[PDB]
Amino acid sequence: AQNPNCNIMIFHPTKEEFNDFDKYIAYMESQGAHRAGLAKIIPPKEWKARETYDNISEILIATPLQQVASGRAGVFTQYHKKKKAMTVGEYRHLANSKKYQTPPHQNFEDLERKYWKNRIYNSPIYGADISGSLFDENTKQWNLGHLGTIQDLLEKECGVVIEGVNTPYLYFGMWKTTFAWHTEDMDLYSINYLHLGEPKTWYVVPPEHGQRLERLARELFPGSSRGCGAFLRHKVALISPTVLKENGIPFNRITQEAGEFMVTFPYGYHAGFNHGFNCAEAINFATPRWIDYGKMASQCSCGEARVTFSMDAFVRILQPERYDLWKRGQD
């Protein structure tokens, strides 16, 4: 069995190996990459996502989200308070202001210590979940707006044609902006490209151990757990590496830098934080190996998780028994 300790693997494809996206995912899996839940892919030196980032300031962040924490430093939830619209140029200036800017630090490990010590005492503002793309149309390799769609994959594997679309999303971050512990909708893959700016630190639980994280979360967030049998779908709970180690939960960590891709694998729980002003692009995707995970994915039916139009068909076809309850949660 490849990668039996579930370490995060880093790949360096050549320009030739970067042509065929599906083939390279399947290659990484042949080497055991999925066992970690997360892999890093460093593009060949010949590749670029676009020519420059000099002309992005007029993109609008219609609903910036202020991430307000409650709890203790290593075990907290966050809620998202909506703020007035602002442009990317306005948000960048805000991120760089004395109130929000990255503090002085020695290295990534010092900054990580400062994040976990101090995150809860601040409320950073995240420009998340913005439909759009920064890949040039002429970039043919690993262009996250030109991937095979999940609806086409389901149709190729199972024969059923379904409605829905699959487009990318932009994330504009600042110091301390936070992504809570989650797996993807329907336990899909994700791919994330860090276009510019400061790093993103990731934490991940191997898919084979995901239920250990879920059991810890029910213990640490007992009110939330009574409210919903899949409350990590709400994407609000944070647990620090120190607390995970104290409770024996297997996990790994890695820092993504500008110009690098990260892939999350089906049922790989992940969480993390941004180091300073940055912009990432991400999208969900599927492969044949996903289908079995989609059929078994938990679902939130309490009303909180509310998701895209395109998840309807995935529930309806892969999980018909659960469909009626889940759709009630959507309505």
Ligand X SMILES: O=C(O)CNC(=O)C(=O)O
Binding site for Ni ion (CB under 5 A): 190
Between 190 and 224, CB nearer to ligand X: 190
Residue entry with tokens 């960048």: 92
Does the annotation flag 6 for ligand binding? no
Q: Taking the complex as a whole, how short is the minimal distance between the CB of residue 282 and ligand X, in angstroms?
A: 4
Q: Which has the closest alpha carbon to 287: 156, 141, 140?
A: 156
Residue entry with tokens 């991430």: 67
Q: Which has the closest alpha carbon to 126: 255, 272, 284?
A: 272
Does the annotation flag 200 for ligand binding? yes
x/- letters, 249..268, toward ligand X (CB under 6 A) = ---------------x----
Please pick, from the candidates 249, 300, 311, 318, the single residue that binds Zn ion as defined by CB under 5 A: 300
Q: Do residues 289 and 266 make contact, with C-beta atoms less than 8 angstroms apart?
A: yes
Give the residue at shortest CB distance from Ni ion: 190
Does the annotation flag 300 for ligand binding? yes
Please pick, from the candidates 16, 54, 58, 219, the single residue that binds Mg ion as defined by CB under 5 A: 58
Between 153 and 271, CB nearer to Ni ion: 271
Contacts by residues 110-113 (CB-CB < 8 Å, ≥ 24 positions apart): 111/275, 112/201
Between 56 and 65, CB nearer to Mg ion: 56
With binding defined as CB under 6 A, does residue 130 bind ligand X? no
Q: Taking the complex as a whole, how short is the minimal distance between the CB of residue 227 and Zn ion, in angstroms?
A: 7
Q: Using CB under 6 A, count the residues that bind ligand X.
A: 8
Strands 60-61 and 38-41: unpaired
Between 145 and 250, CB nearer to Mg ion: 145
With binding defined as CB under 6 A, does residue 280 bind ligand X? yes
Q: Do residues 149 and 162 make contact, with C-beta atoms less than 8 angstroms apart?
A: no
Which strand (E) or helix (H) includes residue 53? none
Options 89-97, 160-168, 180-188, 224-232: segment touching Zn ion (CB under 5 A): 224-232
As a whole number of angstroms, the distance between CA 270 and CA 261 comes to: 15
Strands 261-264 and 125-131: unpaired
Q: Which has the closest alpha carbon to 193: 150, 149, 142, 131?
A: 142
With binding defined as CB under 5 A, does residue 228 bind Zn ion? yes
x/- letters, 189..228, toward ligand X (CB under 6 A) = -x-x------------------------------------
Q: Which residues are CB-contacts of 275 (< 8 A; sequence separation ≥ 6)?
A: 102, 108, 111, 175, 198, 199, 200, 201
As a whole number of angstroms, the distance between CA 98 and CA 101 comes to: 6
Does the annotation flag 126 for ligand binding? yes
Please pick, from the candidates 179, 203, 293, 326, the single residue that binds ligand X as defined by CB under 6 A: 179
Strands 60-61 and 86-87: antiparallel
Residue 62 has a CB neighbour count (10 Å cut-off) of: 10
75: left (phi over 0), alpha (psi -120 to 50) or beta: beta
Does the annotation flag 114 for ligand binding? no
Between 55 and 97, CB nearer to Mg ion: 55
Residue entry with tokens 């902006």: 177
Q: Taking the complex as a whole, how short is the minimal distance between the CB of residue 185 and Ni ion, in angstroms?
A: 9
Does the annotation flag 257 for ligand binding? no
Q: Give the footprint of Zn ion on this chain (CB under 5 A).
A: 228, 300, 302, 304
Q: Give the footprint of ligand X on this chain (CB under 6 A).
A: 171, 179, 190, 192, 264, 270, 280, 282
Annotated binding-site ranges for Fe cation: 182, 184, 270
Annotated binding-site ranges: 126, 182, 184, 192, 200, 228, 234-235, 270, 300, 302
Q: Give the footprint of Mg ion on this chain (CB under 5 A).
A: 56, 58-59
